[PDB]
Swiss-Prot record, chain B:
Family to which this protein belongs: Belongs to the universal ribosomal protein uL23 family.
Stated name of the protein: Large ribosomal subunit protein uL23
Superkingdom: Eukaryota
Annotated signal sequence range: none
Post-translational modification, as annotated: N-terminus is methylated by METTL11A/NTM1. Citrullinated by PADI4.
Protein task: Component of the large ribosomal subunit. The ribosome is a large ribonucleoprotein complex responsible for the synthesis of proteins in the cell. Binds a specific region on the 26S rRNA. May promote p53/TP53 degradation possibly through the stimulation of MDM2-mediated TP53 polyubiquitination.
Shown residues in whole-protein numbering: 105 to 156 of 156
From Swiss-Prot, chain C:
Protein's name in the database: Large ribosomal subunit protein eL37
Record's function text: Component of the large ribosomal subunit. The ribosome is a large ribonucleoprotein complex responsible for the synthesis of proteins in the cell.
PROSITE patterns xref list: RIBOSOMAL_L37E
Places the protein is found: Cytoplasm
Gene: RPL37
GO biological process annotation, one example: translation
Entry similarity comment: Belongs to the eukaryotic ribosomal protein eL37 family.
Lineage start: Eukaryota, Metazoa, Chordata, Craniata, Vertebrata
SUPFAM superfamilies in the cross-refs: Zn-binding ribosomal proteins (SSF57829)
Major subcellular site: cytoplasm
GO molecular function: MDM2/MDM4 family protein binding; rRNA binding; structural constituent of ribosome; ubiquitin ligase inhibitor activity; zinc ion binding
Assembly and oligomerization: Component of the large ribosomal subunit.
C4-type zinc finger locations on the chain: 18-36
From Swiss-Prot, chain E:
Family of this protein: Belongs to the universal ribosomal protein uL24 family.
Subcellular location field: Cytoplasm
Role this protein plays: Component of the large ribosomal subunit. The ribosome is a large ribonucleoprotein complex responsible for the synthesis of proteins in the cell.
UniProt protein name: Large ribosomal subunit protein uL24
Assembly notes: Component of the large ribosomal subunit. Interacts with DHX33.
CDD domains: KOW_RPL26
Alphabetized GO MF terms: RNA binding; structural constituent of ribosome
SUPFAM superfamilies: Translation proteins SH3-like domain
Post-translational note: Ufmylated by UFL1 in response to endoplasmic reticulum stress, promoting reticulophagy of endoplasmic reticulum sheets.
Swiss-Prot record, chain F:
A Pfam family of this chain: Ribosomal_L29
Keyword Ribonucleoprotein: yes
Organism: Oryctolagus cuniculus (Rabbit)
Upper taxonomic lineage: Eukaryota, Metazoa, Chordata, Craniata, Vertebrata
Assembly information from the UniProt record: Component of the large ribosomal subunit.
Job of this protein: Component of the large ribosomal subunit. The ribosome is a large ribonucleoprotein complex responsible for the synthesis of proteins in the cell.
Region (Disordered): 84-122
Name of the protein in question: Large ribosomal subunit protein uL29
Length: 50, 52, 86, 147, 134, 122, 105
RNA sequence: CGACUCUUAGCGGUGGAUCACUCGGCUCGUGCGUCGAUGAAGAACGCAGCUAGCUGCGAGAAUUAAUGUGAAUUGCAGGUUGAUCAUCGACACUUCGAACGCACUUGCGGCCCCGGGUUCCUCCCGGGGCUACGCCUGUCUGAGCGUCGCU
RNA sequence: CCGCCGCAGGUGCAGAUCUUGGUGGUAGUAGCAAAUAUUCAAACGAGAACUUUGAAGGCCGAAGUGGAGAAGGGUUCCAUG
RNA sequence: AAAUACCGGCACGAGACCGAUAGUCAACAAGUACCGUAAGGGAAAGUUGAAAAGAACUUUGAAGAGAGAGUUCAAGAGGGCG
RNA sequence: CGCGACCUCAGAUCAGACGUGGCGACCCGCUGAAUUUAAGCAUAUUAGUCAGCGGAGGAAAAGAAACUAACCAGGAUUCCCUCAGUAACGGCGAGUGAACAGGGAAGAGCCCAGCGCCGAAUCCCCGCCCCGCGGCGGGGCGCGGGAAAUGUGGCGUACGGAAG
């Protein structure tokens, strides 16, 4: 809710930052294995824990 | 703290501060609105520190 | 009215994040981590879960001290000396 | 994906194999010392008679004698150039050329299990005293030294 | 055979060690033969390959007597790029073509204070082994 | 500029602090240029200045502790930073004096009956 | 269930025996390490006998065996006494000493 | 007649078997046999010019010093008196955690020394060092109509 | 990669409401039906029964389909593409 | 003390073993994603080519997509492609 | 009343140390089932086994006879081979079940209290000096402080010991 702790807000901050797509210059490295970010987490589908 | 910010900007920019107001962003980083006492203009200082 | 109707009233968290294991198994009323037993001095483990032990054993974290120990062993815990200068 | 699949039982994907292989299977077999010497005196006796040796595929139509009992200064040798030159002069070399020509690639999973190449077995040099004969002869592909 | 119990002849192990080698071992892996003039001069068989050597290509499509200067040593790829060995792409611009340093022969060295000490040390330890033999 | 450590290890205690401050200033000037989004030549100098800070700092710390642990050498009690950290159990063991101790019973025994060097004839 | 005439067997395998199977793949490495430690010692105590000290003559007890002779543990004190060796010098010049042995005969 | 359906064959699909490969396992053997209040294992949060994960690391943060080494790193930029690697003995090592001022909000104390308000002189601000339990040897301060002693 | 002579086995499938993956017929089928209701023009556009603007006709009818919170959610907020 | 034990740990060497529905649950960002209030449960997923030489340019279309050219021994190997 | 001695206790952020928690294949001490077998079942069996609790080490535990034997006697402990599916236990049913002797692997032995004699001959710690110790140690120095006769050290232990 609007009412948050410091621990929860740091926690939700890390999950926002982690939920960006991969850069396009990583798909051209010599060990080209990662195609796309398989750890994308949408608010409505998967509920983050807590 | 606001006290440490108000000492820092004064020491780092040769300035004077009316008040400091802080909020912690959803990035997990603080953003501090440092209002200056009327002896100094924000736009006069913005140029010399190098933001425009 | 024991299923889909009664799942509408689920808005009160019993487990929060423990402060040793970080796992969401710190019971709030009891005030005890139902995973690692936090207020207890000793770590909660049992031999009936060989799987649960290998998830949280010594080879699953960083080991920032215990890896320099293994490195530092191989020269008999030398200290104070340096290599010969140029 | 695993939820409600099928875990144990040999037929199932995953599941342990039927009668899982143990490490207390009887690997070794012991033989009577009399039989072991009966077998070695019959392995030596067949080496003498050149119909049996030629039927093994050893190319020895130029060896002057089947026993090829060489001098005792064979054991004093110290170079593979002496060891090949000796086999040239005794005319056993065309057996080593047959082993060279046999040097081929194996067929199957043996290749990824550190047995990549195969070849033929050559002349079996029996010596008395080792004064560099093993060092001289071991680099020739096919020779087995024995005591 | 190899008689040392502390050296491995396992296929997978030697393959992993070759592909996970650090740069200073990839240097040595990527040595090239010296040309016959340079061998009779220096008494050295091979040298680790360097940025500004002049070199002949021996095997593959780009072989011949053409002495090209090296311009990149790609250790992550185990390939080297030479002056005029190139290939035209669709959009007209040219690319360099990675040759393994084994399929290549040094016709001129890039000589320093340090490379000269490697040469001397190699040529010296050569004769010490030679006089143990003869 | 490539600021080495060999040169920093022969300068005065007040000089190195000034050099750290003008480096911190220099970084604080580059990090504004990073956010204005200008000059890619000055996004490459963020690593160079940060490592030049780390070099002049580790030179300060190393000269300070080599000075303290020399002054504290000829003394029984020294702080726990400067005491030897081998493993915990290895600190709990007895000294090379307390090993070499042997009771007056033994000292007389191995005076009277030492172990002889002998050989049997066959 | 028994088929015909055949021996009536009682295999001792009703416990969890598979957990406590002791396999002898150690053996040729156990023999090598013993032979290693043996030669190491034999070189360590350099001119002294490799077997160690001299063991005395001893009759096997129990009528089944008393027609034989073994090596005993160590020389009785009343054998050292009448041989004229001190019990604390004997062990230092390579003579095994047993303080428990009586001399009936 | 044709459509429709059936069978076979050619080519094209759908699907990913077979075959060949293997920086991974499984098993057996050998040498060693080392954590932690001098803060462990484990957690959390952070750190790159462009960086989500993996990996590495700790506000000196994909690494500093040192040694060995000898010209790279490389997806794209950018700029031999030692680039880069490995080694690692010097320095460093945020917040939880046995977890240590008291509580787990990072909330509120105390005790001494510094520096801002000022050129110690009080409240306010910032920095530093102490402030857990149990126990051992000694030390200081005591308690007792416990046992005595002397006026 | 295979023949011959020996050697060893986790050695031969149609079935087990067998395991895992894959595809059929049914089948362009059942269906896309709770709570009154949509319409004319214009704009942007390659493209409009559904967007947006206007005009009309309607519904919720202040115990609301309206304005604000608590718990829960965690960037869903806002702009531009 | 020595001789004995050792599926944990650091390091090695090997195999008549398995060869991606097998062999560890894990050959890959695997104790990962995901599920459960929690204890706990727990996957799938290897291969272009020798070398990206990964298809400039013309042309139809709003575009996905095509048609010609072009590289290669080969696209009857076209980016999840032996 | 008062003042020192002693004993029995408190309190300290007093001086200086030490313990806690982790891992847990192997090792030591406790606690300790039921599946199952007996063609049912209750004693038995599974089994002093799984789960639970504590404590360690590079190994641990054991160990120098209050032993085995009945011999022409053996001589600490541990491990292997055999003794041996044996002597023995058992609704004497199902089942369970060692030891001595013998051959080796290894081999190693010792110390207190007590009894007694040596002027407590003994030990810990502070303060100053010198060498010099990343295992805090040796020397000099002190009418410096304490421990200790409610017994420290030397001699000495069942194989005998001590004095003359």
């Amino acid at each position: 809710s609007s009412h948050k702790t410091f621990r929860i807000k740091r926690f939700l901050a890390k999950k926002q930052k982690q939920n960006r797509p991969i850069p396009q210059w990583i798909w051209m490295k010599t060990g080209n294995k990662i195609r796309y970010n398989s750890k994308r987490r949408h608010w409505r589908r998967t509920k983050l824990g807590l | 703290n606001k006290h440490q910010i108000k000492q820092a900007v004064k020491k780092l920019y040769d300035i004077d501060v009316a008040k400091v107001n802080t909020l912690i962003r959803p990035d997990g980083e603080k953003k501090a609105y440092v209002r200056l006492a009327p002896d100094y203009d924000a736009l006069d200082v913005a140029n010399k520190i190098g933001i425009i | 009215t024991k299923g889909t109707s009664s799942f509408g009233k689920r808005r009160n968290k019993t487990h929060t994040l423990c402060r040793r294991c970080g796992s969401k198994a710190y019971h709030l009323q009891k005030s005890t981590c139902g995973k690692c037993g936090y207020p207890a001095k000793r770590k909660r483990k049992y031999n009936w879960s060989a799987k649960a032990k290998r998830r949280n054993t010594t080879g699953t974290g960083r080991m920032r001290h215990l890896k320099i120990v293994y490195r530092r062993f191989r020269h008999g815990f030398r200290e104070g000396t340096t290599p010969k200068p140029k | 994906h695993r939820s409600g699949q099928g875990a144990f039982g040999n037929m199932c994907r995953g599941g342990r194999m039927f009668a899982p292989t143990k490490t207390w299977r009887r690997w070794h077999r012991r033989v009577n010392t009399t039989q072991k010497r009966y077998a070695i005196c019959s392995a030596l006796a067949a080496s003498a008679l050149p119909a049996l040796v030629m039927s093994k595929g050893h190319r020895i139509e130029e060896v002057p004698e089947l026993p090829l009992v060489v001098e005792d200064k064979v054991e004093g040798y110290k170079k593979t150039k002496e060891a090949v030159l000796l086999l040239k002069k005794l005319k056993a070399w065309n057996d080593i050329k047959k082993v060279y020509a046999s040097q081929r690639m194996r067929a199957g999973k043996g290749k990824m299990r550190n047995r990549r190449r195969i070849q033929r077995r050559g002349p079996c040099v029996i010596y008395n005293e080792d004064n560099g004969i093993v060092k001289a002869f071991r680099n020739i592909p096919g020779i087995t030294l024995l005591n | 055979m190899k008689f040392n119990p502390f050296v491995t002849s396992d296929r997978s192990k030697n393959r992993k060690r070759h592909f996970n080698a650090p740069s200073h071992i990839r240097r040595k892996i990527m040595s090239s033969p010296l040309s016959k003039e340079l061998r009779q001069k220096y008494n050295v068989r091979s040298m680790p390959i360097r940025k500004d050597d002049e070199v002949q290509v021996v095997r593959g499509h780009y072989k011949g007597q053409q002495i090209g200067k090296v311009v990149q040593v790609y250790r992550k790829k185990y390939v080297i790029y030479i002056e005029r060995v190139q290939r035209e792409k669709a959009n007209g611009t040219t690319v360099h073509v990675g040759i393994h340093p084994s399929k290549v022969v040094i016709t001129r060295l890039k000589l320093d204070k340090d490379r000269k000490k490697i040469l001397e040390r190699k040529a010296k330890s050569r004769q010490v082994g030679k006089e143990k033999g003869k | 500029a490539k600021i080495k450590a060999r040169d920093l290890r022969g300068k005065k205690k007040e000089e190195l602090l000034k050099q750290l401050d003008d480096l911190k200033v220099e970084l604080s000037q580059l990090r504004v240029a990073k956010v204005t989004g200008g000059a890619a030549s000055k996004l490459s100098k963020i690593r160079v200045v940060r490592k030049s800070i780390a070099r002049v700092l580790t030179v300060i710390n190393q000269t300070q502790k080599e000075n303290l642990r020399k002054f504290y050498k000829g003394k029984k009690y020294k702080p726990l930073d400067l005491r030897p950290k081998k493993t915990r159990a290895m600190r709990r063991r007895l000294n090379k004096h307390e090993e070499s101790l042997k009771t007056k019973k033994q000292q007389r025994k191995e005076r009277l009956y030492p172990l002889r060097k002998y050989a049997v004839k066959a | 269930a028994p088929s015909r005439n055949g021996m009536i067997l009682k295999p001792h395998f009703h416990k969890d025996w598979q957990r406590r199977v002791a396999t002898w793949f150690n053996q040729p490495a156990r023999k090598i390490r013993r032979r290693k430690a043996r030669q190491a010692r034999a070189r360590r105590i350099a001119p002294r006998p490799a077997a160690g000290p001299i063991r005395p003559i001893v009759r096997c007890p129990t009528v089944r065996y008393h027609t034989k002779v073994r090596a005993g543990r160590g020389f009785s004190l009343e054998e050292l006494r009448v041989a004229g060796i001190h019990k604390k010098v004997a062990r230092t010049i390579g003579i095994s000493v047993d303080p428990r042995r009586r001399n009936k005969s």
